[PDB]
Motif scaffolding. Structure first.
Motif, PDB file in Angstrom:
ATOM      1  N   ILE A   1     -17.383  14.210  14.740  1.00  0.00           N
ATOM      2  CA  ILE A   1     -17.249  13.024  13.899  1.00  0.00           C
ATOM      3  C   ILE A   1     -17.720  13.306  12.480  1.00  0.00           C
ATOM      4  O   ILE A   1     -17.256  12.669  11.527  1.00  0.00           O
ATOM      5  CB  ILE A   1     -17.999  11.829  14.517  1.00  0.00           C
ATOM      6  N   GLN A   2     -18.635  14.259  12.307  1.00  0.00           N
ATOM      7  CA  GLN A   2     -19.151  14.560  10.981  1.00  0.00           C
ATOM      8  C   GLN A   2     -18.232  15.469  10.180  1.00  0.00           C
ATOM      9  O   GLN A   2     -18.405  15.580   8.963  1.00  0.00           O
ATOM     10  CB  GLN A   2     -20.538  15.188  11.097  1.00  0.00           C
ATOM     11  N   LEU A   3     -17.265  16.115  10.823  1.00  0.00           N
ATOM     12  CA  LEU A   3     -16.339  16.948  10.077  1.00  0.00           C
ATOM     13  C   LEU A   3     -15.244  16.097   9.447  1.00  0.00           C
ATOM     14  O   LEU A   3     -14.955  14.980   9.882  1.00  0.00           O
ATOM     15  CB  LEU A   3     -15.714  18.019  10.970  1.00  0.00           C
ATOM     16  N   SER A   4     -14.633  16.648   8.405  1.00  0.00           N
ATOM     17  CA  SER A   4     -13.546  15.967   7.729  1.00  0.00           C
ATOM     18  C   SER A   4     -12.300  15.964   8.608  1.00  0.00           C
ATOM     19  O   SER A   4     -12.201  16.690   9.598  1.00  0.00           O
ATOM     20  CB  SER A   4     -13.245  16.637   6.393  1.00  0.00           C
TER      21      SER A   4
ATOM     22  N   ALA B   1     -10.188  11.911   1.248  1.00  0.00           N
ATOM     23  CA  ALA B   1     -10.473  10.740   0.438  1.00  0.00           C
ATOM     24  C   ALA B   1     -10.582   9.524   1.339  1.00  0.00           C
ATOM     25  O   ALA B   1      -9.932   9.448   2.383  1.00  0.00           O
ATOM     26  CB  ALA B   1      -9.388  10.514  -0.612  1.00  0.00           C
ATOM     27  N   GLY B   2     -11.407   8.569   0.934  1.00  0.00           N
ATOM     28  CA  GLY B   2     -11.670   7.428   1.785  1.00  0.00           C
ATOM     29  C   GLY B   2     -10.535   6.433   1.885  1.00  0.00           C
ATOM     30  O   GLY B   2     -10.723   5.254   1.586  1.00  0.00           O
ATOM     31  N   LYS B   3      -9.354   6.881   2.320  1.00  0.00           N
ATOM     32  CA  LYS B   3      -8.223   5.964   2.434  1.00  0.00           C
ATOM     33  C   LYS B   3      -8.402   5.015   3.609  1.00  0.00           C
ATOM     34  O   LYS B   3      -8.420   3.793   3.429  1.00  0.00           O
ATOM     35  CB  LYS B   3      -6.917   6.742   2.573  1.00  0.00           C
ATOM     36  N   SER B   4      -8.525   5.552   4.822  1.00  0.00           N
ATOM     37  CA  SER B   4      -8.757   4.699   5.978  1.00  0.00           C
ATOM     38  C   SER B   4     -10.150   4.100   5.974  1.00  0.00           C
ATOM     39  O   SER B   4     -10.381   3.099   6.656  1.00  0.00           O
ATOM     40  CB  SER B   4      -8.543   5.474   7.274  1.00  0.00           C
ATOM     41  N   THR B   5     -11.086   4.703   5.243  1.00  0.00           N
ATOM     42  CA  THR B   5     -12.379   4.067   5.037  1.00  0.00           C
ATOM     43  C   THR B   5     -12.236   2.804   4.204  1.00  0.00           C
ATOM     44  O   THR B   5     -12.888   1.793   4.480  1.00  0.00           O
ATOM     45  CB  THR B   5     -13.341   5.038   4.365  1.00  0.00           C
ATOM     46  N   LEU B   6     -11.392   2.846   3.175  1.00  0.00           N
ATOM     47  CA  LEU B   6     -11.162   1.661   2.359  1.00  0.00           C
ATOM     48  C   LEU B   6     -10.496   0.562   3.170  1.00  0.00           C
ATOM     49  O   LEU B   6     -10.843  -0.615   3.037  1.00  0.00           O
ATOM     50  CB  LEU B   6     -10.315   2.023   1.143  1.00  0.00           C
TER      51      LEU B   6
ATOM     52  N   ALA C   1      -1.703  -1.231   6.488  1.00  0.00           N
ATOM     53  CA  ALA C   1      -1.004  -0.153   7.169  1.00  0.00           C
ATOM     54  C   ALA C   1      -1.744   1.145   6.899  1.00  0.00           C
ATOM     55  O   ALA C   1      -1.869   1.562   5.745  1.00  0.00           O
ATOM     56  CB  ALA C   1       0.442  -0.065   6.692  1.00  0.00           C
ATOM     57  N   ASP C   2      -2.239   1.777   7.958  1.00  0.00           N
ATOM     58  CA  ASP C   2      -3.041   2.992   7.839  1.00  0.00           C
ATOM     59  C   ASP C   2      -2.156   4.180   8.191  1.00  0.00           C
ATOM     60  O   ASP C   2      -2.121   4.637   9.332  1.00  0.00           O
ATOM     61  CB  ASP C   2      -4.268   2.923   8.734  1.00  0.00           C
ATOM     62  N   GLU C   3      -1.459   4.695   7.186  1.00  0.00           N
ATOM     63  CA  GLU C   3      -0.519   5.797   7.344  1.00  0.00           C
ATOM     64  C   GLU C   3       0.499   5.546   8.459  1.00  0.00           C
ATOM     65  O   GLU C   3       0.649   6.370   9.364  1.00  0.00           O
ATOM     66  CB  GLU C   3      -1.259   7.104   7.588  1.00  0.00           C
ATOM     67  N   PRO C   4       1.226   4.433   8.416  1.00  0.00           N
ATOM     68  CA  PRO C   4       2.287   4.235   9.397  1.00  0.00           C
ATOM     69  C   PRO C   4       3.418   5.197   9.097  1.00  0.00           C
ATOM     70  O   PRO C   4       3.511   5.759   8.005  1.00  0.00           O
ATOM     71  CB  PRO C   4       2.710   2.784   9.177  1.00  0.00           C
TER      72      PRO C   4
ATOM     73  N   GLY D   1     -24.918  11.262   5.627  1.00  0.00           N
ATOM     74  CA  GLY D   1     -25.313  11.436   4.247  1.00  0.00           C
ATOM     75  C   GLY D   1     -24.229  11.929   3.318  1.00  0.00           C
ATOM     76  O   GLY D   1     -24.545  12.541   2.294  1.00  0.00           O
ATOM     77  N   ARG D   2     -22.961  11.693   3.641  1.00  0.00           N
ATOM     78  CA  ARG D   2     -21.850  12.090   2.790  1.00  0.00           C
ATOM     79  C   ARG D   2     -21.108  10.855   2.299  1.00  0.00           C
ATOM     80  O   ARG D   2     -21.070   9.827   2.982  1.00  0.00           O
ATOM     81  CB  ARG D   2     -20.897  13.032   3.527  1.00  0.00           C
ATOM     82  N   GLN D   3     -20.528  10.960   1.106  1.00  0.00           N
ATOM     83  CA  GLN D   3     -19.941   9.812   0.430  1.00  0.00           C
ATOM     84  C   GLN D   3     -18.463   9.690   0.778  1.00  0.00           C
ATOM     85  O   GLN D   3     -17.658  10.551   0.408  1.00  0.00           O
ATOM     86  CB  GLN D   3     -20.127   9.945  -1.078  1.00  0.00           C
TER      87      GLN D   3
HETATM   88  N1  LIG Z   1     -17.596   8.122  11.447  1.00  0.00           N
HETATM   89  C1  LIG Z   1     -17.761   8.967  10.428  1.00  0.00           C
HETATM   90  N2  LIG Z   1     -18.932   9.632  10.322  1.00  0.00           N
HETATM   91  C2  LIG Z   1     -19.102  10.478   9.302  1.00  0.00           C
HETATM   92  N3  LIG Z   1     -18.253  10.785   8.318  1.00  0.00           N
HETATM   93  C3  LIG Z   1     -17.103  10.112   8.448  1.00  0.00           C
HETATM   94  C4  LIG Z   1     -16.782   9.209   9.447  1.00  0.00           C
HETATM   95  N4  LIG Z   1     -15.504   8.706   9.258  1.00  0.00           N
HETATM   96  C5  LIG Z   1     -15.090   9.307   8.171  1.00  0.00           C
HETATM   97  N5  LIG Z   1     -16.004  10.172   7.629  1.00  0.00           N
HETATM   98  C6  LIG Z   1     -15.841  10.977   6.426  1.00  0.00           C
HETATM   99  O1  LIG Z   1     -15.427  10.126   5.379  1.00  0.00           O
HETATM  100  C7  LIG Z   1     -14.556  10.845   4.479  1.00  0.00           C
HETATM  101  C8  LIG Z   1     -13.288  10.058   4.253  1.00  0.00           C
HETATM  102  O2  LIG Z   1     -13.075   9.149   5.347  1.00  0.00           O
HETATM  103  P1  LIG Z   1     -11.708   9.110   6.130  1.00  0.00           P
HETATM  104  O3  LIG Z   1     -11.466   7.723   6.724  1.00  0.00           O
HETATM  105  O4  LIG Z   1     -11.717  10.201   7.114  1.00  0.00           O
HETATM  106  O5  LIG Z   1     -10.583   9.338   5.049  1.00  0.00           O
HETATM  107  P2  LIG Z   1      -9.114   9.713   5.501  1.00  0.00           P
HETATM  108  O6  LIG Z   1      -9.118  10.893   6.387  1.00  0.00           O
HETATM  109  O7  LIG Z   1      -8.306   9.936   4.224  1.00  0.00           O
HETATM  110  O8  LIG Z   1      -8.437   8.495   6.232  1.00  0.00           O
HETATM  111  P3  LIG Z   1      -7.272   8.768   7.229  1.00  0.00           P
HETATM  112  O9  LIG Z   1      -7.739   8.393   8.666  1.00  0.00           O
HETATM  113  O10 LIG Z   1      -6.900  10.277   7.171  1.00  0.00           O
HETATM  114  S1  LIG Z   1      -5.719   7.686   6.772  1.00  0.00           S
HETATM  115  C9  LIG Z   1     -14.368  12.239   5.077  1.00  0.00           C
HETATM  116  O11 LIG Z   1     -15.209  13.182   4.425  1.00  0.00           O
HETATM  117  C10 LIG Z   1     -14.766  12.049   6.541  1.00  0.00           C
HETATM  118  O12 LIG Z   1     -15.313  13.239   7.094  1.00  0.00           O
END
Ligand SMILES: Nc1ncnc2c1ncn2[C@@H]1O[C@H](COP(=O)(O)OP(=O)(O)OP(O)(O)=S)[C@@H](O)[C@H]1O
Ligand SMILES: Nc1ncnc2c1ncn2[C@@H]1O[C@H](COP(=O)(O)OP(=O)(O)OP(O)(O)=S)[C@@H](O)[C@H]1O
Ligand SMILES: Nc1ncnc2c1ncn2[C@@H]1O[C@H](COP(=O)(O)OP(=O)(O)OP(O)(O)=S)[C@@H](O)[C@H]1O
Ligand SMILES: Nc1ncnc2c1ncn2[C@@H]1O[C@H](COP(=O)(O)OP(=O)(O)OP(O)(O)=S)[C@@H](O)[C@H]1O
Ligand SMILES: Nc1ncnc2c1ncn2[C@@H]1O[C@H](COP(=O)(O)OP(=O)(O)OP(O)(O)=S)[C@@H](O)[C@H]1O
Lengths: 222, 49, 50, 222, 222, 221, 221
Positions: F140-143, D43-48, D165-168, D18-20
């Motif tokens: 997995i739920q933590l940042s 931030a959603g970098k690797s999510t993007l 590239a995911d933080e190479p 339930g988090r964005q």
């Molecule tokens: N599988 C997951 N379940 C729940 N929350 C997630 C999951 N993956 C990521 N998140 C959350 O999504 C948010 C951003 O996603 P991330 O992909 O972790 O962003 P990011 O950390 O900048 O990418 P990287 O891996 O560091 S380059 C954060 O608040 C994470 O906790």
């Protein structure tokens, strides 16, 4: 758009050793634009700045300075191309055996100017760089960041239409480098383009000028 | 069609990767049919008798 | 790890369901053959007792 | 404009907790554009970068890869989406139990290629990364910045339409990081977009590429 | 284009000492734009931010805030100009003799608001800055980067149409400075422009926002 | 001097490929010293940190942990060498299928502890890192910056005499990296030496700690 | 201590213009020490490096090279002082009309060496810098980062007891600057002191070497 001061089309520069200094460099610069030419060591940064002055001729493509094509500029017209171009290098090319006054007054004698005309302009040019009351001393006894200030003064004499800075402040302090950059901005304000090539990270990062990022001879990516 | 050559190569190199476990497993699969087979033979021979 | 890498690179669901399919089929065939051979030799050895 | 290679509309990604991870990300990338995806840690970098490959599906909005909408891409067509996408992570996903030659030759076997076809392309791909004569050694005995060079070699095999590239170079030296970036620029020159996500300050500051600055899931500010 | 929120035309500001703080500053800012105002020490950075609030009047040119010209704004209408402008300085102007709750609730009392209306907004504003449960303590016993967070909270109260940050985080840690910048981005997301003037190199280099580079009173070069 | 917690003689580590990872690395660390281990990628920064934990054995030279020699420590005695060493890696090795509370209580049960004892220490350890009220949730739920925070929490359980960090905050923001470094000081204050090995330039330049420079396997100089 | 390779007393250098380039610069360098000489532009960084080579003579104070005084070294003995000093400048002083092989064999023939001896040493020197198989080509054909590499190769021929670098890598990329600095470590390992004088900030901040700060001619402090 209007009258692009500098314009490359598909310029390439291959040397007698058979290696590529540039490959397909295409860009244009408006009359007044200030830009930075960054890149790694082996990239054709000073090669790009050499083609503009007519020091070197491209192996392909075309180069437009002001409104005139200078790709195959005749050797008779080359000295009049460089008269509109100010050239600053990493190190000063100062003639250390002669006074700063005459060392700055050279470009006017090149073009041909009255003796009193020379007196007025070099005094003004030595004042914009802030180096008046220094016209009687020799370049050897001025400090390191002070010889370069004359090199800009010599270039700015005769009102060049473009300054080409080839890694200036490369042997200068960070505090001195910013001062030289504020000098170049001073000239860019009135009418003259600048193509400062540089390696400094904290010098281009404090300004919002166009950055040209050469990489193995390929010019622009952003 | 070239896809089913890496398939055979990978399967065979996988079976040969751990010959200890591979031989153990083929042995214990051999036992599991051995007795059904022999009990069918004692099924047919007494049927003939 | 190889399966994860293959799926990430873009291996289809049938590419991953292959080495195993052939591996299992070969294993079953070889086990049945060896089991039948062993059964035949053991019944022929008990033929000495009979 | 033309055929935007990557395009988000109002993409959001909310996870089962339930988090964005993203909120209203809207951007497009031309076929050939090199851009940097910067932002803080949460931030959603690797999510993007995950939504582009089809590893994760958006909770809202739409995603356009090349000309095809992949918002609700069917699980049968996903393996053919990732075949046009090169993926490089912070750490190499190399299979350390197998030779580099085959570890690089995997994508061609995935697509299905002749044995001699595989020999030619992996030799070329191992040469652009500059890692030929290394095809017989295992990934364990190559140095730290040398395993990553294979990971780029594996991605560049099969001519991907985009490298993600995911933080190479996150565990690489500053001298090595610049070399990897010159490699990515080498591919971007011909026809392939790059979306290098990164944390480095002196790597993006030396280049003039588009920067996408994610901040708590909000994508672009400049 | 549309309704430029801030717009200078040929603005100059010469002081009673006869020196030029600005010279021909011309720019405009869209309603929602986030920009950085960088420059050296003697450049009219805080002078530029002073003209917008009506604290100082230009010596030439014109200034347009929202749709209204404020070049010669009448002294009766000045207090209603600053009510739409949030002002943050390098140091907090907090009234250290009074509780944070009232120190944040000042702008609503200025405009005139219900007692219960004040309770709701300051509680919300103290929550966006993340400083709730701190409303009862005095500014003296909050930590250094915590007093500034109230200064932003006081500014963001009453929903200003523009925040003008005059070198905030100048006496703050690098870790704290980034947090304050993520706060400003939080407000910029909804509807409000930001004109953060700053000296930090690694704060503007991580973001892709418009940079205005003042130099001896001359505003934009890139 | 006194009891050097870590001491290396003229040490070397050549791997099965016949290449020198370390060469003549000599140094000593007092009980309470905080130092930075910097170098390029091809320098044995992690190899140096691996010899201390007994994960790898030197090809030459001698290594002393506390007051004992571990150059040729028997495989029977290694598990008690790693119980006084806190190991933080660049990528957190958290167990993804298990809650944080049980992901930080692992070191305690390794040595053997009471259920009440386990509850008290992990709760205190999860509070020093500031990740309390988070123990019931899965990693997995933590940042991305709290999963690491659990990693240090796991390392500091059992009160190790030395903390070894292998490029932590490599995948962390600059704002987060300072916070993690302020965590390691909180531990270096009381009784635990720290050997932070890192590539960062603005994290080690804000402190006045000893810097161990590795260049092609040659330390300091 | 032992035999201080370089030692300055209360030294000063006023030029013909009557201005102080150095003032009271006192320090000493052990045989094997690597140090950085930093300062602003108006500080006598190159003047300090010039007194060591005998290029300039101090106006006061005393200078000791190895175990000998060179404060008033006669013009007969200077050429043997510069044979133990490696001199690398910001701009390479390579001879542009002569091949690299003969551009690096100059120091050997200065002292006088056999043709076979010259061949062996320059080939080894050109291999330490990694520029072998490049000796037959002219310096103009090499890149901006290899011409410098020949400069160090020329300096390290004859095995100098001290390497003096006057802002090298000033016209070199940051990636190349680290490579040049890793070259100077390779030499500082065996027997040669290094006095790298530089303006760089991210090259000296990654190492733990002694930093000699010059401010208006006043050293260190
Ligand atoms: N599988 C997951 N379940 C729940 N929350 C997630 C999951 N993956 C990521 N998140 C959350 O999504 C948010 C951003 O996603 P991330 O992909 O972790 O962003 P990011 O950390 O900048 O990418 P990287 O891996 O560091 S380059 C954060 O608040 C994470 O906790
Ligand atoms: N031949 C000279 N005559 C007069 N003054 C000189 C001479 N050489 C140097 N100076 C002055 O001495 C001071 C310091 O000179 P330098 O030693 O060159 O300092 P420096 O600039 O740090 O050296 P660099 O940049 O590494 S070449 C400056 O004020 C120079 O003007
Ligand atoms: N198992 C191994 N087999 C062969 N060579 C190895 C092995 N482990 C490390 N090396 C080599 O040892 C050298 C240094 O390795 P590392 O100790 O990992 O250096 P490192 O990259 O600084 O460590 P990191 O980045 O903190 S994991 C490199 O040349 C590696 O190729
Ligand atoms: N009240 C004043 N009287 C006279 N000159 C002033 C006054 N305020 C500023 N100046 C001058 O105006 C110029 C630039 O104005 P400043 O506001 O000081 O610029 P600034 O210093 O960049 O802004 P800050 O406060 O540092 S963010 C300088 O030359 C100041 O000396
Ligand atoms: N006269 C020349 N003959 C042969 N190759 C040359 C020559 N001049 C330059 N090159 C090569 O051209 C390439 C780039 O040219 P350069 O002008 O050296 O670029 P650059 O080094 O970035 O410019 P500077 O001087 O450092 S600002 C390099 O590979 C050089 O080796």
């Amino acid at each position: 758009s209007g009258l692009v001061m500098i314009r490359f089309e598909h310029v390439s520069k291959a040397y007698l050793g058979g290696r590529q200094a540039l490959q397909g460099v295409t860009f244009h610069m408006q009359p007044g634009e200030m830009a930075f030419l960054t890149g790694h060591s082996g990239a054709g940064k000073s090669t790009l700045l050499k083609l503009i002055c007519g020091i070197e001729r491209p192996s392909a493509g075309k180069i437009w300075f002001s409104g005139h094509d200078i790709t195959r500029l005749k050797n008779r017209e080359v000295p009049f191309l460089r008269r509109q171009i100010g050239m600053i290098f990493q190190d000063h090319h100062l003639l250390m055996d002669r006074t700063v006054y005459d060392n700055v007054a050279i470009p006017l004698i090149i073009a041909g100017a009255s003796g009193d005309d020379i007196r007025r302009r070099v005094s003004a040019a030595l004042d914009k760089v802030g180096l008046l009351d220094k016209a009687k001393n020799f370049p050897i006894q001025l400090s390191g960041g002070e010889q370069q200030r004359v090199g800009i003064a010599r270039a700015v004499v005769n009102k060049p239409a473009v300054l080409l800075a080839d890694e200036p402040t490369g042997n200068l302090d960070d505090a001195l480098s910013e001062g030289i950059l504020r000098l170049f901005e001073e000239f860019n304000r009135v009418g003259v383009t600048v193509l400062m090539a540089t390696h400094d990270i904290n010098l281009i990062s404090r300004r919002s000028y166009r950055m040209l990022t050469l990489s193995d001879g390929h010019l622009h990516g952003g | 069609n070239e896809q089913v050559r890496y398939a055979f190569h990978g399967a065979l190199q996988d079976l040969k990767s751990k010959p200890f476990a591979t031989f153990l497993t083929v042995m214990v699969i051999a036992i599991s049919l051995t007795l059904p087979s022999v009990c069918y033979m004692v099924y047919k021979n007494v049927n003939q008798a | 790890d190889s399966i994860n890498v293959q799926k990430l690179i873009g291996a289809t669901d049938g590419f991953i369901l292959r080495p195993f399919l052939y591996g299992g089929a070969l294993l079953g065939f070889s086990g049945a053959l060896l089991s039948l051979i062993l059964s035949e030799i053991l019944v022929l050895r008990l033929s000495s007792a009979v």
